[PDB]
Design a protein around this ligand. Sequence first.
Ligand code: CLA
Ligand code: CLA
Ligand code: CLA
Ligand code: CLA
Ligand code: CLA
Ligand SMILES: CC(=O)O[C@H]1CC(C)(C)C(=C=C/C(C)=C/C=C/C(C)=C/C=C/C=C(C)/C=C/C=C(/C)C(=O)C[C@@]23O[C@]2(C)C[C@@H](O)CC3(C)C)[C@](C)(O)C1
Ligand code: KC1
Ligand code: KC1
Ligand SMILES: CC1=C(/C=C/C(C)=C/C=C/C(C)=C/C=C/C=C(C)/C=C/C=C(C)/C=C/C2=C(C)CCCC2(C)C)C(C)(C)CCC1
Lengths: 75, 169, 137, 213, 188, 163
Amino acid sequence: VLFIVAGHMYRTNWGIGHSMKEILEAHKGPFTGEGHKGLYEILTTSWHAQLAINLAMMGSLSIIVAHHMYAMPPY
Amino acid sequence: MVGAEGPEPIPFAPSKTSKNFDPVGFAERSPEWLPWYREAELKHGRAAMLATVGFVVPEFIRVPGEQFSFEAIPKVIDAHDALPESMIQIFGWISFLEACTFPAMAGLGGKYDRKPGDFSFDPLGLYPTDPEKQKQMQLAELKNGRLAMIAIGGMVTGAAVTGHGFPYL
Amino acid sequence: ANFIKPYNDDPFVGHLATPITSSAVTRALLKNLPAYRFGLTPLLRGLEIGLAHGYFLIGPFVKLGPLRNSDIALIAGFLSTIGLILILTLGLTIYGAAVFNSTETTLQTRKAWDQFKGGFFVGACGSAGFALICLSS
Amino acid sequence: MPERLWDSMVDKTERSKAVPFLPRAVNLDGSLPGDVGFDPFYLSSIPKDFSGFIQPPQWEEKGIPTLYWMREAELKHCRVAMLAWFGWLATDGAFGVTLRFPGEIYSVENIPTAYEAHNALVSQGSMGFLLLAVGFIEFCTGAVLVEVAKGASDREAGDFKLDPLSFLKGKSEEEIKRMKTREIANGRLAMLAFGGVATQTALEGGNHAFPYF
Amino acid sequence: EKSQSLPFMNRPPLLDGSMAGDVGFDPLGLSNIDDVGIDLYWLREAEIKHCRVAMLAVVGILQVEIFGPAPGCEMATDKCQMDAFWQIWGAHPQYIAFGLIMIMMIEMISGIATTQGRESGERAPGDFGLDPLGYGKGDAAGYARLQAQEIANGRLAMFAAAGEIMQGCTTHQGALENLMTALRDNSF
Amino acid sequence: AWKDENIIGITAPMGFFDPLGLSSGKSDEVMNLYREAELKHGRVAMAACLGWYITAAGVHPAFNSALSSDPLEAAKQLPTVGWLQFVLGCGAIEWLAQQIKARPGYQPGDILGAAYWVDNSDEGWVDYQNKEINNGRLAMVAFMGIFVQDLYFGNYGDQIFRN
Ligand code: CLA
Ligand code: CLA
Ligand code: CLA
Ligand code: CLA
Ligand code: CLA
Ligand SMILES: CC(=O)O[C@H]1CC(C)(C)C(=C=C/C(C)=C/C=C/C(C)=C/C=C/C=C(C)/C=C/C=C(/C)C(=O)C[C@@]23O[C@]2(C)C[C@@H](O)CC3(C)C)[C@](C)(O)C1
Ligand code: KC1
Ligand code: KC1
Ligand SMILES: CC1=C(/C=C/C(C)=C/C=C/C(C)=C/C=C/C=C(C)/C=C/C=C(C)/C=C/C2=C(C)CCCC2(C)C)C(C)(C)CCC1
């Protein structure tokens, strides 16, 4: 339910939903200049920048899996 | 604007006169709060006038309910604490009447032309048509309203110190 | 709006004016430290450095040294502090012997660094001996 | 310090007719049938598009006037409560006959007063079928508010074309407005009337039966 | 222009009275959908298939609850057809699985005919060319009446087949004795 | 007067809020001392609230995890050697803020010295400065009302919602 509800967050053909570009360009403060402007164009034109995030997350996830499977043994 | 005449000398201060009576000087310190002050003086004045009649009339006649009787409550001074279900219905309908004045309180300055204290409430038509005694009709409400503000403090503490009837002892 | 600007309005120096480097807390604390305070004889500069540094340096030596749980624990932490101060004074002596070659009260000269390390050695052995008094009685 | 929203809500030249010390709301014009200028909290002047509750503003750019939404909601509150106050009293025998359905689920030995009829038939299942039947009409009639919010329809508020006996077929506009005012006036009274019956029976003093005091 | 069924609403723009049961009843605007493989062609084919499945399901219930199950299936004996399915599945499950795979080939071919009939224009929605007696050859006014009578009986049977499922899965009796129960319960 | 160049704190619903007229006729020097007092009261009271609310229900560990469930009795069992430390430790900052005060471009609550980077001409920095002083003014009266209900009414927690 939490994943199906979260898969209705982003804007598509029906107007409702968030644009990821307009989320990022809104998040900027007095220390960080333009803020997250331009990060949407990086992550939709660079396969290497997406693989940078996805490998760092799947590797961090596999490490979390290791701690969580010994301590709360699921099988 | 209308309340600053006299002669009406101040007791326990024999030199001061009540003409333009403002020793702290709220009129020069904050003149934009003056229509808020007149609205607050009249609301303090009109509530204290009914409080004076409301403090001496239940001494003699009571409403025919038998939880308001003299055997139930002989003193008027504990009727607030003895009839709680009667107080929420006064507090509830005043709260409705006060909530319909928030857009009038939100425009008390130069927003719209309502004079402070003027609720357009004259069903019996007793406001005179000529303007020069409208001001003394306004002055009569202020002087009777200022007096009942003083009197309801004397009426309550005159009955809290000496439990007695109307005049006091 | 922008709390990071180039330092000294110079976009090409390797420094930024951040609220760590250029805040009023940083500007008022650093200019009153004895390394940078305006009206200070170089003997008085090092004396304030020594009184600050010799006082806390007896701390790790009395509570953690090899003579921790002895009745001579405090005088062992005091002697270890004086030995550390003599090592630091030797480091100040050989620094000034090589850096400065032959106006007074300017700290970065040869004559004033001999005043500065002399005041450091007196102030550090003085405030280590002062903490020796306050930790005993 | 900014320009106050107070100025955009009130007329500032005219007074409210029902509350004379208050300035008139900008949308209350006297054109609607029950209009006596009564809006002391200025709820008709709220700049939100309230048809967002049905179809969100992010779906497409639309906007319904607040007075159109409020009158459509007032008329639905009027017509529901007129039937509901009548339906509470007719199944309690206030008009002589205790009107019940022929089924024994709805008999007076099973459900003694109309006070107990809600919880008895949520458990049985009659109220769940009513919520399907009402919700079907509300999906098929509530979508015209989106059509009005887009500026496509000229429908008045609460103005389905439901005159099966044709009381307003060849009538003029001031007698239609009189007939629309009698709907609003009897509806506003029955909303307070349903408020009386639903609350007086809900006190611990009791009297679930007519006359509910 | 206003809808016939909802005269307070405007007419839905893609409904123009060309299809059989068109009286403009689309308040939610679902005929304007054109995105997730779904348009007016797909919904009309879905309506017509829901019409024909529910029409056969109603007489498929009323055949067994009146005249009994077919020979070879006399093991049913229950008037509740939601329970009589599980007695045929309990004893001869191969014929149900025979039909369910025969439907699976028919329906996958019908799913190709729908999407190829939509991309081209040589197939009306719900049209399979199954007119073996040939009612569609003459009297186009009398053929449009049959197109409307299919939709009118099919929209009615949709409520009936959905009801006989639901009031069979909740009363466990059968459709015709749910009807006799309601007649004696609500008699006045 | 002074309020025209010092627009911090002038927020809706009030305008410039001064019924008693304490700002009327007063110099800019004493008005800057009132802003230094208002910000310092508002910043101690915001930290007092977070000091009250953590030690009331939560994370009062440690001082050996003892000494503290109620914040007013917890100001007693700690030694006064730890009290004048806190007194001298804040007075080191009150000394350092005097050196920040004795500078030409000093604004009457600007210990960080944010006037080096932004002035009061951009609206986002004024709006965030107003958020500090509004929450400071709110935490002033909300510290006094919750000190007084623990001094008199006995309870140190949430007398509005629950517990
Ligand atoms: C509390 C209700 C109240 C209010 C809002 C006002 C407001 C006003 N009065 Mg009125 N007045 C009042 C009660 C009030 N008065 C009473 C009870 C009397 C009879 C004593 C008077 C006698 C009086 C005269 C003779 C005149 C006014 C005038 C005015 C106006 C001048 C502006 C001003 O100074 O503001 C006043 C601000 C306040 C009242 C709020 C401050 C309250 C203080 C801080 C509390 C202390 C009050 C008191 C000393 C309490 C003592 C008890 C204590 C020792 C325990 C203003 C509309 C003048 C006028 O009408 O000019 C057009 C004028 O000439 N007043
Ligand atoms: C680096 C890890 C480490 C640490 C933490 C220790 C710790 C210790 N050693 Mg061990 N030791 C180590 C590695 C370490 N050792 C190594 C690599 C060897 C060689 C093999 C030894 C061989 C050894 C011997 C032979 C002995 C010790 C002893 C000790 C104890 C006392 C030492 C002392 O008095 O120094 C004094 C410390 C200082 C003068 C300064 C400490 C650093 C300060 C606190 C930093 C402060 C920075 C500040 C927080 C930041 C600025 C704040 C603000 C101004 C901005 C102490 C428990 C003695 C002992 O008896 O053990 C119980 C002892 O006899 N050590
Ligand atoms: C606000 C209106 C309203 C509501 C919510 C109720 C609710 C109820 N009635 Mg009551 N009733 C009402 C008015 C209402 N009544 C009126 C005006 C009458 C005529 C006097 C009755 C006569 C009546 C009798 C005789 C009985 C009830 C009973 C009941 C209870 C069960 C009914 C049920 O579930 O069967 C389902 C009902 C239906 C399927 C009827 C059709 C409802 C339609 C679909 C509603 C929408 C149509 C609407 C009228 C017009 C649409 C306008 C739109 C097109 C714009 C339930 C608490 C029974 C009970 O238990 O009493 C204790 C019972 O025996 N009602
Ligand atoms: C929704 C339609 C539907 C469904 C799901 C059922 C299901 C069932 N019927 Mg029922 N029945 C139906 C309609 C239906 N019937 C109709 C229309 C009638 C005539 C009025 C009957 C008369 C009937 C009798 C007399 C009996 C049953 C029985 C049964 C049960 C076992 C039979 C079986 O499994 O055959 C297996 C399936 C097949 C042999 C083939 C199915 C048909 C194939 C898929 C062709 C379909 C073509 C399609 C209709 C049109 C063309 C599609 C495309 C080209 C466009 C089973 C639960 C028996 C039972 O046990 O009752 C309890 C029983 O005795 N049925
Ligand atoms: C296809 C249409 C249809 C029909 C005819 C039925 C019929 C029935 N359903 Mg089913 N049902 C349906 C679809 C249908 N359902 C659907 C789509 C679903 C959801 C999927 C269900 C889910 C369902 C469940 C869960 C149950 C039923 C039940 C029932 C029975 C209840 C009795 C009833 O309320 O009748 C409807 C009542 C009327 C139509 C009232 C008649 C109004 C009259 C004719 C108006 C005339 C008044 C006149 C103008 C006034 C003048 C006369 C006066 C002067 C005397 C009844 C046999 C229940 C059951 O099985 O009982 C044993 C049950 O539990 N249904
Ligand atoms: C230039 C100068 O300065 O000279 C001065 C000289 C001079 C003349 C002295 C002036 C003055 C100062 C004045 C007049 C000050 C007067 C102040 C006044 C008149 C203050 C009472 C208010 C009424 C109340 C509180 C009513 C309560 C009403 C009730 C019912 C209650 O007591 C509450 C209660 O029922 C409950 C709810 C709960 C229970 O527990 C029981 C009780 C009964 C307790 C001037 C004009 O300023 C000028
Ligand atoms: C702005 C923040 C604020 C809130 C949110 C707040 C709320 C409540 N106050 Mg507090 N109050 C102040 C501020 C606030 N009060 C200030 C600055 C003072 C002067 C120091 C003050 C004085 C008193 C006294 C003497 C009593 C008192 C009470 C209540 C109680 C009333 C509920 C009711 O009974 O209607 C609710 C919780 C009485 C009580 O019963 O405390 C448990 C009580 O005796 N207050
Ligand atoms: C309006 C802002 C706000 C403040 C400033 C505030 C502060 C405190 N709350 Mg309160 N509170 C709410 C709002 C606020 N709380 C809300 C919206 C709810 C849900 C309706 C709520 C419920 C509870 C419960 C059950 C408890 C509770 C407590 C405290 C206590 C310690 C901090 C903490 O741990 O929350 C501090 C004084 C505990 C307590 O009183 O311990 C003695 C406690 O048990 N709160
Ligand atoms: C503030 C602060 C801080 C800091 C802290 C610290 C770091 C401290 C240090 C301090 C110290 C570090 C101190 C010192 C002291 C010292 C002293 C006090 C000394 C004195 C000495 C003396 C007095 C001596 C004398 C003598 C001599 C010289 C010789 C002869 C003998 C005698 C002994 C007499 C921080 C960061 C946390 C932040 C917050 C605030």
